[PDB]
C-alpha cells in the first residue's frame, strides 16, 4: 500500500526540505508534510494495478492475418500494433513468456503450425511441409473453443531487445541491419483451414507473463512509421509533388496563451 | 510557435514594475502539459489517480540575477486567481533565488472524493498552479532575462487505478 500521511505542525526550520537541486539529477523527496499542515490520514490505496506484471499482462492484440486460400502466415512480433508496441517501448530489455490466443471467425477445422526459427514453413495450404514430425502444431475447431498455448522465453540472451543500438555484420559489410531485427526471431505461425466453412479473419492475442522489465525509457511520443525501425518522420503523400514533405505526428497540443490556461 | 522546438520547455521572465501572472498550469493529467511528461504519460493509462504532485521550478539565469516568485495552487472549485492577492490565499510557497535555483511546490491532495478522474471534468477538477512575481526578477543589467523551467513528479502516496488505453498514442496508418 501507499504510506499514510503524517501530521505536521507549524515548522520554523533552518534546513529547507523544499529548496532542492534539479541539476544533481535526483528527484525531490518533498511530501506534503514539508510544505503545509497535514493531518494523519489512514491511506490504503495500492499501486497494484501499476506493477509491470499487471500493467503489461493483459493479452493485447499483436497481429491480424487473412486466410487467402485457406492459408495465412504471421511472423511473431509486437511491432505492428502501435498501442502495445508503445507499452513495450517503455522499457529497454524485457523477459517474458507469452501466451498466444487465436480469435478466428472461421468455422471448420483449422491448424496452426508454430515454425521454430531456421526451417522452411509451408508456403501454401495442402503443402507437403504441413505433415511435420517435430514442428509443434495446434488443431482446433473454432466453434467451441479458442486455441491457446504458451511459448516460453526463447531469447538467445537474458532478455528481449526492445531497442538495439547495433548492427549484426562488421563495418565494411553491405546489408547491415540496424535495430533489433536480427537480434531475435520468435518463429512464425502458419494458419490453414481444412474445411471451407467460415471467414478469413484471424486475430492473435498475446499475453506477456512472468515479465521482468529492465531499463525504463521515455515513452514513445510520436506515431510510428515502420516496424523494427523507430523512425517517426511520416511521409504522407508519396504520389503527389510533395513526397519530400515529412509530417511529424506528435501529440503535443498547443494552448493560445500561457498564464491563461 | 514553440511546439516542436526545445524552446517550449522554458519561459522568459524579466524585471517588471508590477506583479504579473507568469504561468498557469491547470492540474489536469490530460492536459498537454502533464500528459506528455513521465508523470502524465504513466497516469494517462489509468482512469483515476489520487495523490500528491511535486512541481520543481528552476530558474536558469546568471549568477548575479536574483528574484522571488510566489507559486500558488488554487484548490479545486476555486476560480483562476488573476490577482496575487487572490492567488496567495490557497496553498502557496515563496522561493528566493540564490546559490540554489530549484524550488518545489508539493501540490497536496485536496479533494472531496477519494480518486480524481484523469480526463479532467468539472466535477473532479484539480485546480490551477499559478506562478507570480513575488517581488520582481532583478537581473544585473537593464534588459536582462531569466528562463524558468518546471518538472513534475509524484509523491510516494500517489496511486492510480482502472488501467485503460492511453489517449497519448494513435495508429492511423498500417505499420509496414
Amino acid at each position: 500500500v501507499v504510506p499514510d500521511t503524517k501530521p505536521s505542525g507549524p515548522q520554523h526550520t533552518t534546513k529547507p526540505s523544499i529548496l532542492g537541486a534539479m541539476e544533481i539529477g535526483a528527484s525531490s523527496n518533498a511530501t506534503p508534510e514539508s510544505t503545509i499542515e497535514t493531518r494523519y490520514v489512514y491511506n490504503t490505496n495500492t499501486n497494484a494495478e501499476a506493477d509491470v506484471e499487471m500493467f503489461l499482462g493483459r493479452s493485447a492484440l499483436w497481429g491480424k492475418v487473412t486466410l487467402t486460400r485457406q492459408y495465412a502466415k504471421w511472423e511473431i512480433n509486437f511491432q505492428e500494433q502501435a498501442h502495445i508496441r508503445k507499452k513495450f517501448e517503455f522499457f529497454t530489455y524485457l523477459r517474458f513468456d507469452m501466451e498466444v490466443t487465436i480469435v478466428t471467425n472461421n468455422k471448420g477445422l483449422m491448424q496452426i503450425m508454430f515454425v521454430p526459427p531456421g526451417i522452411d514453413h509451408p508456403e501454401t495450404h495442402d503443402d507437403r511441409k504441413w505433415d511435420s514430425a517435430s514442428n509443434p502444431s495446434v488443431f482446433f475447431q473454432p466453434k467451441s473453443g479458442f486455441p491457446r498455448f504458451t511459448i516460453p522465453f526463447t531469447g538467445l540472451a537474458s532478455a528481449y531487445y526492445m531497442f538495439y543500438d547495433g548492427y549484426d555484420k562488421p563495418k565494411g559489410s553491405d546489408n547491415n541491419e540496424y535495430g533489433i531485427a536480427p537480434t531475435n526471431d520468435m518463429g512464425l505461425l502458419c494458419f490453414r483451414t481444412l474445411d471451407n466453412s467460415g471467414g478469413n479473419d484471424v486475430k492473435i492475442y498475446v499475453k506477456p507473463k512472468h515479465i521482468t522489465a529492465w531499463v525504463p525509457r521515455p515513452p514513445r511520443a510520436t506515431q510510428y512509421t515502420h516496424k523494427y525501425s523507430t523512425n517517426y518522420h511520416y511521409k504522407p503523400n508519396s504520389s503527389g509533388p510533395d513526397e519530400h514533405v515529412l509530417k511529424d505526428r506528435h501529440f503535443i497540443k498547443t494552448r493560445p496563451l500561457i498564464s491563461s490556461a | 510557435g514553440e511546439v516542436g522546438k526545445v524552446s517550449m520547455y522554458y519561459i522568459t521572465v524579466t524585471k517588471k514594475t508590477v506583479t504579473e501572472r507568469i504561468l498557469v498550469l491547470p492540474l489536469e493529467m490530460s492536459n498537454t502539459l502533464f500528459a506528455t511528461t513521465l508523470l502524465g504519460e504513466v497516469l494517462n493509462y489509468y482512469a483515476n489517480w489520487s495523490g500528491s504532485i511535486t512541481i520543481t521550478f528552476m530558474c536558469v539565469c546568471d549568477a548575479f540575477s536574483t528574484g522571488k516568485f510566489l507559486v500558488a495552487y488554487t484548490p479545486p472549485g476555486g476560480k483562476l486567481p488573476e490577482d496575487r492577492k487572490q492567488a496567495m490565499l490557497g496553498v502557496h510557497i515563496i522561493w528566493d533565488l540564490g546559490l540554489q535555483s530549484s524550488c518545489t511546490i508539493v501540490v497536496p491532495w485536496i479533494s472531496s472524493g477519494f480518486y480524481r478522474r484523469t480526463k479532467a471534468d468539472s466535477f473532479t477538477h484539480g485546480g490551477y498552479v499559478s506562478l507570480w512575481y513575488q517581488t520582481a526578477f532583478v537581473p544585473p543589467v537593464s534588459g536582462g532575462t531569466g528562463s524558468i523551467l518546471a518538472t513534475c513528479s509524484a509523491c510516494p502516496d500517489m496511486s492510480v487505478r482502472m488501467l485503460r488505453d492511453s489517449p497519448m498514442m494513435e495508429q492511423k496508418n498500417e505499420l509496414q
Binding site: 539529477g25 528527484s27 506484471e53 499482462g57 513468456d97 504458451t150 522465453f153 507473463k209 512472468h210 | 513528479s153
Partner: peptide
C-alpha cells in the same frame, strides 16, 4: 495454488524506487 500443467512456464500471472529518483553516490 495448483499448477495443472506440471510446468513453470504454464503458470498464471506472477507477482525500491531509489534506483531512479536518487542515483547518487
Amino acid at each position: 495454488n495448483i499448477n495443472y500443467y506440471k510446468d513453470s512456464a504454464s503458470s498464471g500471472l506472477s507477482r525500491d524506487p531509489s534506483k531512479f529518483t536518487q542515483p547518487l553516490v
